Amino acid sequence: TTDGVYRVMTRLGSTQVGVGVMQEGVFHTMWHVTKGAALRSGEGRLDPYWGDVKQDLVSYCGPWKLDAAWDGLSEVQLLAVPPGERAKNIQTLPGIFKTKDGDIGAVALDYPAGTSGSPILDKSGRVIGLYGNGVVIKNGSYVSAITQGKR
Amino acid sequence: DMYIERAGDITWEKDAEVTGNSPRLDVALDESGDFSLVE
């Protein structure tokens, strides 16, 4: 229930398939991490509430709550939660995905796939998007969009 | 069979590790959520 960043694990052996953000009682992760499946939190169960394959986002127990956005100028921080590592902050200046529908910030950071869903933060600590949907430009140089929903 | 475990607070960490480029890329986004490069 408590706000924060969470590992998404799956059950022999346990594997980390992703990361998500709990905020205002709603769990936020990327759609390709869970494919919309229900999640367990302690003895409780978290049920999908909203999802969108095109945005590659899903929320549990409530509507999408994150609405901060990159200002287009300042450095941000990827709060990466890699499998088997403690959460760590990676500061970077985002690149830009230029699209027909406008510009999207993007971070040229390449972490293991179980880090998908890790939040990208602004200088005030607000989540401006989630990590792990993007493109490869040349020889596994992965660039992730800063993927944010609509509150 | 999927469960969540808390991993930390959501906080900016002053004087954190800094890395990464800032490429500017023309991209297209299709219905499947897939980004692709465009020229």
mmCIF file of all heavy atoms in Angstrom, chain A residues 30 32 53-57 96-107 130-137 142-148, chain B residues 25-38:
data_model
loop_
_atom_site.group_PDB
_atom_site.id
_atom_site.type_symbol
_atom_site.label_atom_id
_atom_site.label_comp_id
_atom_site.label_asym_id
_atom_site.label_seq_id
_atom_site.Cartn_x
_atom_site.Cartn_y
_atom_site.Cartn_z
ATOM 1 N N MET A 30 4.346 -0.951 -16.582
ATOM 2 C CA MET A 30 4.146 -1.023 -18.018
ATOM 3 C C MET A 30 3.389 -2.289 -18.388
ATOM 4 O O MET A 30 3.505 -3.331 -17.732
ATOM 5 C CB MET A 30 5.469 -0.931 -18.787
ATOM 6 C CG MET A 30 6.445 0.099 -18.212
ATOM 7 S SD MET A 30 7.618 0.751 -19.420
ATOM 8 C CE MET A 30 6.580 1.700 -20.560
ATOM 9 N N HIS A 32 3.610 -4.369 -20.899
ATOM 10 C CA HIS A 32 4.350 -5.560 -21.308
ATOM 11 C C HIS A 32 4.987 -6.297 -20.135
ATOM 12 O O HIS A 32 5.446 -7.432 -20.313
ATOM 13 C CB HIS A 32 5.421 -5.203 -22.351
ATOM 14 C CG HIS A 32 6.665 -4.598 -21.777
ATOM 15 N ND1 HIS A 32 6.814 -3.240 -21.593
ATOM 16 C CD2 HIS A 32 7.824 -5.164 -21.368
ATOM 17 C CE1 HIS A 32 8.010 -2.996 -21.086
ATOM 18 N NE2 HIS A 32 8.643 -4.147 -20.940
ATOM 19 N N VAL A 53 -2.293 -0.817 -24.473
ATOM 20 C CA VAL A 53 -1.136 -1.444 -25.107
ATOM 21 C C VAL A 53 -0.339 -0.429 -25.914
ATOM 22 O O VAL A 53 0.888 -0.553 -26.041
ATOM 23 C CB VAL A 53 -1.598 -2.642 -25.970
ATOM 24 C CG1 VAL A 53 -0.598 -2.971 -27.090
ATOM 25 C CG2 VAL A 53 -1.803 -3.863 -25.100
ATOM 26 N N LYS A 54 -1.005 0.591 -26.467
ATOM 27 C CA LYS A 54 -0.282 1.565 -27.287
ATOM 28 C C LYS A 54 0.640 2.425 -26.433
ATOM 29 O O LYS A 54 1.798 2.664 -26.802
ATOM 30 C CB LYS A 54 -1.254 2.454 -28.065
ATOM 31 C CG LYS A 54 -0.520 3.539 -28.859
ATOM 32 C CD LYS A 54 -1.395 4.230 -29.889
ATOM 33 C CE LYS A 54 -0.523 5.049 -30.847
ATOM 34 N NZ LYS A 54 -1.247 5.523 -32.065
ATOM 35 N N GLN A 55 0.141 2.913 -25.297
ATOM 36 C CA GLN A 55 1.000 3.590 -24.333
ATOM 37 C C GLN A 55 1.914 2.619 -23.594
ATOM 38 O O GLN A 55 2.918 3.052 -23.014
ATOM 39 C CB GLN A 55 0.140 4.355 -23.327
ATOM 40 C CG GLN A 55 -0.586 5.530 -23.943
ATOM 41 C CD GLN A 55 -1.521 6.205 -22.969
ATOM 42 O OE1 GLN A 55 -1.100 6.675 -21.913
ATOM 43 N NE2 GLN A 55 -2.799 6.264 -23.321
ATOM 44 N N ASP A 56 1.577 1.331 -23.600
ATOM 45 C CA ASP A 56 2.302 0.293 -22.864
ATOM 46 C C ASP A 56 2.281 0.550 -21.355
ATOM 47 O O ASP A 56 3.295 0.419 -20.666
ATOM 48 C CB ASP A 56 3.746 0.144 -23.373
ATOM 49 C CG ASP A 56 4.424 -1.101 -22.833
ATOM 50 O OD1 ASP A 56 3.717 -2.111 -22.614
ATOM 51 O OD2 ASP A 56 5.660 -1.079 -22.626
ATOM 52 N N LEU A 57 1.101 0.890 -20.836
ATOM 53 C CA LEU A 57 0.936 1.229 -19.427
ATOM 54 C C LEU A 57 -0.254 0.479 -18.840
ATOM 55 O O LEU A 57 -1.209 0.151 -19.547
ATOM 56 C CB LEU A 57 0.727 2.729 -19.251
ATOM 57 C CG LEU A 57 1.955 3.579 -19.577
ATOM 58 C CD1 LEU A 57 1.616 5.048 -19.450
ATOM 59 C CD2 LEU A 57 3.116 3.203 -18.634
ATOM 60 N N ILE A 96 15.447 13.109 -27.146
ATOM 61 C CA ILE A 96 14.088 13.398 -27.592
ATOM 62 C C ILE A 96 13.684 12.408 -28.678
ATOM 63 O O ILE A 96 14.440 12.182 -29.632
ATOM 64 C CB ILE A 96 13.964 14.846 -28.109
ATOM 65 C CG1 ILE A 96 14.143 15.836 -26.953
ATOM 66 C CG2 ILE A 96 12.621 15.067 -28.779
ATOM 67 C CD1 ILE A 96 14.398 17.260 -27.391
ATOM 68 N N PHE A 97 12.504 11.802 -28.514
ATOM 69 C CA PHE A 97 11.792 11.122 -29.592
ATOM 70 C C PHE A 97 10.892 12.151 -30.258
ATOM 71 O O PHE A 97 9.902 12.584 -29.662
ATOM 72 C CB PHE A 97 10.919 9.980 -29.075
ATOM 73 C CG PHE A 97 11.664 8.719 -28.705
ATOM 74 C CD1 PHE A 97 13.041 8.624 -28.807
ATOM 75 C CD2 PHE A 97 10.946 7.614 -28.255
ATOM 76 C CE1 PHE A 97 13.692 7.438 -28.460
ATOM 77 C CE2 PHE A 97 11.584 6.441 -27.902
ATOM 78 C CZ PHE A 97 12.959 6.354 -28.005
ATOM 79 N N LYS A 98 11.210 12.523 -31.492
ATOM 80 C CA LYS A 98 10.367 13.440 -32.247
ATOM 81 C C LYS A 98 9.371 12.642 -33.082
ATOM 82 O O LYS A 98 9.763 11.825 -33.927
ATOM 83 C CB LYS A 98 11.223 14.360 -33.114
ATOM 84 C CG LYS A 98 12.488 14.824 -32.407
ATOM 85 C CD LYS A 98 13.235 15.861 -33.208
ATOM 86 C CE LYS A 98 14.193 15.208 -34.181
ATOM 87 N NZ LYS A 98 14.053 15.798 -35.543
ATOM 88 N N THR A 99 8.088 12.865 -32.826
ATOM 89 C CA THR A 99 7.020 12.113 -33.465
ATOM 90 C C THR A 99 6.044 13.069 -34.141
ATOM 91 O O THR A 99 6.116 14.286 -33.977
ATOM 92 C CB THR A 99 6.274 11.219 -32.458
ATOM 93 O OG1 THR A 99 5.253 11.975 -31.807
ATOM 94 C CG2 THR A 99 7.229 10.674 -31.391
ATOM 95 N N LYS A 100 5.117 12.495 -34.915
ATOM 96 C CA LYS A 100 4.079 13.305 -35.548
ATOM 97 C C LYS A 100 3.189 13.985 -34.515
ATOM 98 O O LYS A 100 2.630 15.054 -34.788
ATOM 99 C CB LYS A 100 3.232 12.440 -36.483
ATOM 100 C CG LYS A 100 2.455 11.346 -35.768
ATOM 101 C CD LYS A 100 1.269 10.861 -36.585
ATOM 102 C CE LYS A 100 1.683 9.783 -37.574
ATOM 103 N NZ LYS A 100 1.650 8.424 -36.961
ATOM 104 N N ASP A 101 3.045 13.390 -33.331
ATOM 105 C CA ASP A 101 2.201 13.925 -32.274
ATOM 106 C C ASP A 101 2.984 14.726 -31.240
ATOM 107 O O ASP A 101 2.462 14.983 -30.150
ATOM 108 C CB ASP A 101 1.438 12.792 -31.582
ATOM 109 C CG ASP A 101 0.552 12.012 -32.539
ATOM 110 O OD1 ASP A 101 0.036 12.617 -33.502
ATOM 111 O OD2 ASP A 101 0.366 10.796 -32.325
ATOM 112 N N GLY A 102 4.215 15.114 -31.547
ATOM 113 C CA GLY A 102 5.014 15.932 -30.656
ATOM 114 C C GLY A 102 6.211 15.171 -30.112
ATOM 115 O O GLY A 102 6.434 13.996 -30.409
ATOM 116 N N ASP A 103 6.981 15.880 -29.294
ATOM 117 C CA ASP A 103 8.221 15.358 -28.740
ATOM 118 C C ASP A 103 7.959 14.594 -27.453
ATOM 119 O O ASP A 103 7.072 14.948 -26.670
ATOM 120 C CB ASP A 103 9.215 16.488 -28.475
ATOM 121 C CG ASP A 103 9.736 17.117 -29.751
ATOM 122 O OD1 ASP A 103 9.333 16.668 -30.844
ATOM 123 O OD2 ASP A 103 10.542 18.065 -29.652
ATOM 124 N N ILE A 104 8.730 13.531 -27.252
ATOM 125 C CA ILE A 104 8.731 12.756 -26.019
ATOM 126 C C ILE A 104 10.169 12.672 -25.530
ATOM 127 O O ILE A 104 11.073 12.364 -26.314
ATOM 128 C CB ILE A 104 8.150 11.343 -26.233
ATOM 129 C CG1 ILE A 104 6.728 11.425 -26.794
ATOM 130 C CG2 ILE A 104 8.164 10.552 -24.936
ATOM 131 C CD1 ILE A 104 6.310 10.186 -27.575
ATOM 132 N N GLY A 105 10.388 12.970 -24.250
ATOM 133 C CA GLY A 105 11.695 12.740 -23.671
ATOM 134 C C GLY A 105 12.080 11.274 -23.749
ATOM 135 O O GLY A 105 11.229 10.385 -23.780
ATOM 136 N N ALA A 106 13.386 11.019 -23.791
ATOM 137 C CA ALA A 106 13.863 9.646 -23.863
ATOM 138 C C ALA A 106 15.240 9.575 -23.227
ATOM 139 O O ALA A 106 16.023 10.523 -23.317
ATOM 140 C CB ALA A 106 13.903 9.129 -25.306
ATOM 141 N N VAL A 107 15.529 8.450 -22.568
ATOM 142 C CA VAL A 107 16.773 8.290 -21.823
ATOM 143 C C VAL A 107 17.593 7.181 -22.468
ATOM 144 O O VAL A 107 17.085 6.082 -22.727
ATOM 145 C CB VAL A 107 16.529 8.031 -20.324
ATOM 146 C CG1 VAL A 107 15.786 9.231 -19.713
ATOM 147 C CG2 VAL A 107 15.745 6.711 -20.085
ATOM 148 N N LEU A 130 7.752 6.190 -16.962
ATOM 149 C CA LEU A 130 8.306 4.873 -16.673
ATOM 150 C C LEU A 130 9.261 4.441 -17.777
ATOM 151 O O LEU A 130 9.080 4.790 -18.947
ATOM 152 C CB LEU A 130 7.203 3.823 -16.520
ATOM 153 C CG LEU A 130 6.204 4.033 -15.367
ATOM 154 C CD1 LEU A 130 5.260 2.844 -15.264
ATOM 155 C CD2 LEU A 130 6.886 4.295 -14.035
ATOM 156 N N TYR A 131 10.259 3.647 -17.384
ATOM 157 C CA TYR A 131 11.350 3.210 -18.247
ATOM 158 C C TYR A 131 11.046 1.847 -18.861
ATOM 159 O O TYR A 131 10.566 0.938 -18.179
ATOM 160 C CB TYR A 131 12.659 3.141 -17.434
ATOM 161 C CG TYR A 131 13.845 2.504 -18.134
ATOM 162 C CD1 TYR A 131 14.638 3.234 -19.020
ATOM 163 C CD2 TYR A 131 14.185 1.187 -17.887
ATOM 164 C CE1 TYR A 131 15.744 2.653 -19.650
ATOM 165 C CE2 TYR A 131 15.279 0.597 -18.509
ATOM 166 C CZ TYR A 131 16.055 1.330 -19.384
ATOM 167 O OH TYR A 131 17.127 0.722 -20.001
ATOM 168 N N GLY A 132 11.342 1.698 -20.152
ATOM 169 C CA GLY A 132 11.366 0.361 -20.714
ATOM 170 C C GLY A 132 10.590 0.106 -21.995
ATOM 171 O O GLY A 132 10.473 -1.052 -22.404
ATOM 172 N N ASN A 133 10.037 1.145 -22.624
ATOM 173 C CA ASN A 133 9.530 1.053 -23.991
ATOM 174 C C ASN A 133 10.321 2.023 -24.851
ATOM 175 O O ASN A 133 10.324 3.230 -24.576
ATOM 176 C CB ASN A 133 8.036 1.374 -24.093
ATOM 177 C CG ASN A 133 7.458 0.958 -25.439
ATOM 178 O OD1 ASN A 133 8.061 0.156 -26.156
ATOM 179 N ND2 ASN A 133 6.304 1.513 -25.801
ATOM 180 N N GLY A 134 10.968 1.507 -25.897
ATOM 181 C CA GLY A 134 11.821 2.358 -26.705
ATOM 182 C C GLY A 134 12.325 1.763 -28.002
ATOM 183 O O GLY A 134 11.624 0.982 -28.648
ATOM 184 N N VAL A 135 13.541 2.150 -28.407
ATOM 185 C CA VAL A 135 14.126 1.749 -29.683
ATOM 186 C C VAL A 135 15.605 1.454 -29.499
ATOM 187 O O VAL A 135 16.225 1.843 -28.504
ATOM 188 C CB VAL A 135 13.981 2.823 -30.783
ATOM 189 C CG1 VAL A 135 12.579 2.869 -31.307
ATOM 190 C CG2 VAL A 135 14.439 4.180 -30.261
ATOM 191 N N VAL A 136 16.167 0.760 -30.491
ATOM 192 C CA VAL A 136 17.602 0.523 -30.613
ATOM 193 C C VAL A 136 18.083 1.253 -31.860
ATOM 194 O O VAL A 136 17.488 1.108 -32.936
ATOM 195 C CB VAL A 136 17.915 -0.982 -30.699
ATOM 196 C CG1 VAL A 136 19.345 -1.206 -31.130
ATOM 197 C CG2 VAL A 136 17.643 -1.655 -29.352
ATOM 198 N N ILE A 137 19.143 2.047 -31.734
ATOM 199 C CA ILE A 137 19.574 2.879 -32.854
ATOM 200 C C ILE A 137 20.738 2.260 -33.623
ATOM 201 O O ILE A 137 20.741 2.293 -34.855
ATOM 202 C CB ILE A 137 19.882 4.325 -32.405
ATOM 203 C CG1 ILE A 137 20.733 4.370 -31.146
ATOM 204 C CG2 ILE A 137 18.576 5.057 -32.149
ATOM 205 C CD1 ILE A 137 20.822 5.765 -30.533
ATOM 206 N N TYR A 142 20.261 0.971 -26.643
ATOM 207 C CA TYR A 142 18.843 1.099 -26.348
ATOM 208 C C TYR A 142 18.544 2.483 -25.797
ATOM 209 O O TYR A 142 19.280 3.011 -24.957
ATOM 210 C CB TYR A 142 18.421 0.024 -25.358
ATOM 211 C CG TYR A 142 16.943 0.015 -25.017
ATOM 212 C CD1 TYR A 142 16.012 -0.571 -25.865
ATOM 213 C CD2 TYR A 142 16.489 0.586 -23.840
ATOM 214 C CE1 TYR A 142 14.663 -0.586 -25.545
ATOM 215 C CE2 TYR A 142 15.147 0.574 -23.503
ATOM 216 C CZ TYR A 142 14.237 -0.012 -24.358
ATOM 217 O OH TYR A 142 12.903 -0.016 -24.018
ATOM 218 N N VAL A 143 17.471 3.082 -26.301
ATOM 219 C CA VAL A 143 16.967 4.356 -25.814
ATOM 220 C C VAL A 143 15.507 4.154 -25.449
ATOM 221 O O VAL A 143 14.718 3.677 -26.273
ATOM 222 C CB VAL A 143 17.113 5.476 -26.861
ATOM 223 C CG1 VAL A 143 16.641 6.806 -26.287
ATOM 224 C CG2 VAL A 143 18.549 5.567 -27.345
ATOM 225 N N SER A 144 15.156 4.489 -24.211
ATOM 226 C CA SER A 144 13.798 4.309 -23.717
ATOM 227 C C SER A 144 13.049 5.631 -23.762
ATOM 228 O O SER A 144 13.557 6.651 -23.291
ATOM 229 C CB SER A 144 13.808 3.767 -22.284
ATOM 230 O OG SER A 144 12.487 3.659 -21.775
ATOM 231 N N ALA A 145 11.834 5.611 -24.302
ATOM 232 C CA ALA A 145 10.943 6.741 -24.088
ATOM 233 C C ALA A 145 10.731 6.960 -22.595
ATOM 234 O O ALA A 145 10.780 6.020 -21.795
ATOM 235 C CB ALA A 145 9.594 6.492 -24.772
ATOM 236 N N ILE A 146 10.497 8.212 -22.212
ATOM 237 C CA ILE A 146 9.963 8.517 -20.893
ATOM 238 C C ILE A 146 8.446 8.412 -21.035
ATOM 239 O O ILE A 146 7.796 9.342 -21.505
ATOM 240 C CB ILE A 146 10.411 9.894 -20.399
ATOM 241 C CG1 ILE A 146 11.941 9.992 -20.423
ATOM 242 C CG2 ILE A 146 9.868 10.147 -19.001
ATOM 243 C CD1 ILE A 146 12.491 11.341 -19.956
ATOM 244 N N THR A 147 7.883 7.259 -20.662
ATOM 245 C CA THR A 147 6.483 6.939 -20.947
ATOM 246 C C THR A 147 5.604 7.366 -19.779
ATOM 247 O O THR A 147 5.697 6.793 -18.692
ATOM 248 C CB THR A 147 6.300 5.438 -21.209
ATOM 249 O OG1 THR A 147 7.008 5.058 -22.396
ATOM 250 C CG2 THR A 147 4.802 5.087 -21.384
ATOM 251 N N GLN A 148 4.717 8.332 -20.011
ATOM 252 C CA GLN A 148 3.836 8.830 -18.971
ATOM 253 C C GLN A 148 2.388 8.717 -19.440
ATOM 254 O O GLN A 148 2.096 8.856 -20.631
ATOM 255 C CB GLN A 148 4.188 10.281 -18.614
ATOM 256 C CG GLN A 148 3.281 10.939 -17.575
ATOM 257 C CD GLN A 148 3.424 10.334 -16.190
ATOM 258 O OE1 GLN A 148 3.021 9.198 -15.957
ATOM 259 N NE2 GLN A 148 3.979 11.105 -15.254
ATOM 260 N N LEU B 25 15.941 11.767 -32.009
ATOM 261 C CA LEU B 25 15.586 10.682 -32.916
ATOM 262 C C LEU B 25 14.194 10.912 -33.477
ATOM 263 O O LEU B 25 13.266 11.214 -32.721
ATOM 264 C CB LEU B 25 15.621 9.336 -32.184
ATOM 265 C CG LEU B 25 16.949 9.018 -31.504
ATOM 266 C CD1 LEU B 25 16.777 8.009 -30.396
ATOM 267 C CD2 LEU B 25 17.955 8.529 -32.539
ATOM 268 N N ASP B 26 14.045 10.733 -34.793
ATOM 269 C CA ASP B 26 12.731 10.661 -35.430
ATOM 270 C C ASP B 26 12.152 9.266 -35.220
ATOM 271 O O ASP B 26 12.766 8.275 -35.630
ATOM 272 C CB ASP B 26 12.845 10.934 -36.926
ATOM 273 C CG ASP B 26 13.325 12.326 -37.232
ATOM 274 O OD1 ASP B 26 13.144 13.221 -36.385
ATOM 275 O OD2 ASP B 26 13.878 12.518 -38.338
ATOM 276 N N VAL B 27 10.976 9.167 -34.590
ATOM 277 C CA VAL B 27 10.390 7.864 -34.298
ATOM 278 C C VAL B 27 8.918 7.848 -34.679
ATOM 279 O O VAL B 27 8.253 8.884 -34.758
ATOM 280 C CB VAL B 27 10.558 7.443 -32.816
ATOM 281 C CG1 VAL B 27 12.005 7.585 -32.362
ATOM 282 C CG2 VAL B 27 9.630 8.225 -31.915
ATOM 283 N N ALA B 28 8.421 6.635 -34.912
ATOM 284 C CA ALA B 28 7.016 6.353 -35.155
ATOM 285 C C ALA B 28 6.532 5.356 -34.111
ATOM 286 O O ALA B 28 7.279 4.465 -33.702
ATOM 287 C CB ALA B 28 6.793 5.786 -36.566
ATOM 288 N N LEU B 29 5.285 5.512 -33.673
ATOM 289 C CA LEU B 29 4.682 4.647 -32.666
ATOM 290 C C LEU B 29 3.451 3.995 -33.280
ATOM 291 O O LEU B 29 2.530 4.698 -33.714
ATOM 292 C CB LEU B 29 4.312 5.450 -31.411
ATOM 293 C CG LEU B 29 3.555 4.741 -30.279
ATOM 294 C CD1 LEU B 29 4.387 3.633 -29.662
ATOM 295 C CD2 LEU B 29 3.141 5.734 -29.215
ATOM 296 N N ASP B 30 3.435 2.661 -33.332
ATOM 297 C CA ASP B 30 2.324 1.970 -33.965
ATOM 298 C C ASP B 30 1.306 1.522 -32.918
ATOM 299 O O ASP B 30 1.457 1.754 -31.715
ATOM 300 C CB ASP B 30 2.817 0.808 -34.843
ATOM 301 C CG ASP B 30 3.420 -0.362 -34.053
ATOM 302 O OD1 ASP B 30 3.152 -0.540 -32.839
ATOM 303 O OD2 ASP B 30 4.173 -1.136 -34.680
ATOM 304 N N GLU B 31 0.240 0.876 -33.398
ATOM 305 C CA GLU B 31 -0.859 0.506 -32.518
ATOM 306 C C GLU B 31 -0.423 -0.486 -31.449
ATOM 307 O O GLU B 31 -1.020 -0.529 -30.369
ATOM 308 C CB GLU B 31 -2.007 -0.087 -33.336
ATOM 309 C CG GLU B 31 -3.253 0.760 -33.375
ATOM 310 C CD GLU B 31 -4.305 0.173 -34.299
ATOM 311 O OE1 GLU B 31 -4.303 -1.064 -34.485
ATOM 312 O OE2 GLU B 31 -5.120 0.944 -34.848
ATOM 313 N N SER B 32 0.598 -1.295 -31.730
ATOM 314 C CA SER B 32 1.084 -2.282 -30.772
ATOM 315 C C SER B 32 1.984 -1.688 -29.688
ATOM 316 O O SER B 32 2.543 -2.447 -28.880
ATOM 317 C CB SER B 32 1.824 -3.394 -31.512
ATOM 318 O OG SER B 32 0.902 -4.185 -32.236
ATOM 319 N N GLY B 33 2.113 -0.365 -29.630
ATOM 320 C CA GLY B 33 3.003 0.277 -28.681
ATOM 321 C C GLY B 33 4.464 0.260 -29.075
ATOM 322 O O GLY B 33 5.309 0.703 -28.290
ATOM 323 N N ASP B 34 4.791 -0.222 -30.269
ATOM 324 C CA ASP B 34 6.176 -0.353 -30.689
ATOM 325 C C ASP B 34 6.658 0.942 -31.328
ATOM 326 O O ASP B 34 6.033 1.456 -32.263
ATOM 327 C CB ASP B 34 6.330 -1.525 -31.657
ATOM 328 C CG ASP B 34 6.091 -2.862 -30.979
ATOM 329 O OD1 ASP B 34 6.479 -2.997 -29.797
ATOM 330 O OD2 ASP B 34 5.509 -3.767 -31.619
ATOM 331 N N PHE B 35 7.769 1.466 -30.816
ATOM 332 C CA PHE B 35 8.466 2.564 -31.467
ATOM 333 C C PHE B 35 9.366 2.025 -32.575
ATOM 334 O O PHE B 35 9.950 0.944 -32.453
ATOM 335 C CB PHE B 35 9.325 3.337 -30.466
ATOM 336 C CG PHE B 35 8.550 4.149 -29.472
ATOM 337 C CD1 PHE B 35 8.465 3.743 -28.153
ATOM 338 C CD2 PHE B 35 7.948 5.344 -29.847
ATOM 339 C CE1 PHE B 35 7.772 4.492 -27.221
ATOM 340 C CE2 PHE B 35 7.244 6.108 -28.916
ATOM 341 C CZ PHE B 35 7.159 5.678 -27.601
ATOM 342 N N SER B 36 9.493 2.789 -33.652
ATOM 343 C CA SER B 36 10.458 2.476 -34.693
ATOM 344 C C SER B 36 11.093 3.768 -35.188
ATOM 345 O O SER B 36 10.487 4.838 -35.110
ATOM 346 C CB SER B 36 9.815 1.708 -35.860
ATOM 347 O OG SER B 36 8.948 2.533 -36.614
ATOM 348 N N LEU B 37 12.323 3.658 -35.690
ATOM 349 C CA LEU B 37 13.010 4.795 -36.285
ATOM 350 C C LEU B 37 12.389 5.149 -37.630
ATOM 351 O O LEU B 37 11.932 4.277 -38.371
ATOM 352 C CB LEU B 37 14.488 4.468 -36.485
ATOM 353 C CG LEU B 37 15.297 4.264 -35.204
ATOM 354 C CD1 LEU B 37 16.744 3.957 -35.539
ATOM 355 C CD2 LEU B 37 15.196 5.497 -34.314
ATOM 356 N N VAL B 38 12.386 6.444 -37.953
ATOM 357 C CA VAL B 38 11.966 6.915 -39.270
ATOM 358 C C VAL B 38 13.014 7.891 -39.782
ATOM 359 O O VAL B 38 13.762 8.489 -39.004
ATOM 360 C CB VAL B 38 10.567 7.577 -39.268
ATOM 361 C CG1 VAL B 38 9.544 6.690 -38.580
ATOM 362 C CG2 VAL B 38 10.609 8.942 -38.616
#
